[PDB]
Amino acid sequence: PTDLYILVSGAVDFTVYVDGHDQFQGKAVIGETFGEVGVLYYRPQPFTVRTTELSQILRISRTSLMSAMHAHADDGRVIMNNLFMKLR
Amino acid sequence: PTDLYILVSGAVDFTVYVDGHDQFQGKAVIGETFGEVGVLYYRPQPFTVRTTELSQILRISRTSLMSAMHAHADDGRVIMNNLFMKLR
Structure with missing residues (x-):
């Protein structure tokens, strides 16, 4: 993991990568953040993150969080x- | 602060020290711990702690907690x- 991804607009579609050939589930809507695994868990992200319609995504990265600590x-x-x- | 004080038996009576001349409130019963201020807050204890009838008090101290961290x-x-x- 490298950064937090707060949505400000735009849909997001998450699907299983490698372990899952197709389908599965993954979602986030306007205002709903993700990347909250790598806050302090320091662990890789579970899902895949592919956009559907274009979006505006804030980025408070990992070192910026640890500077805010x-x-x-x-x-x-x-x-x-x-x-x-x-x-x- | 220096140590956690888990009661195993015996009553405990807590009264205000210096700020309060008399009365006030302070309590802990069999099994009910105290000293939970100085877990990570690193701050002095609020009350006074005077025994009423004799007790048996475990002590997991501050450095033992930080070793358990x-x-x-x-x-x-x-x-x-x-x-x-x-x-x-």
Whole structure:
């Protein structure tokens, strides 16, 4: 992983790559972020990400996140949102 | 702060020290831990801790906790329990 990809517009279609020959599932809509695996898990992305109609995608990359790490006492809220986010 | 104090038996009475001349509130019962401020907050303890009847108190100290930190992928559950613990 290298960067966060917040959508601002445009549809996104995710399909299984190598493990899955065709079909499967993958989605993200306007405002719905992805790339939240490689926040601190430092692990590769699960799916493939192919666009359908054109989009505008912000990019707060990995080193920019880790530079934002020293601004603490509010990263606890982010990490609580991560834990309650993935457990549900 | 220096150590965690898990009760195993015995009552504990906590009263305000210096800021409060008398009364106030402070409690912990069999099994109910305290010292959970100085987990990662690295901040001094709020209350005073005076025993009432004798007790048996375990002690997993600060350096022992920080030695337990490298055993990861299950400290996330501890930190989620911290965040959902204090926010309620």
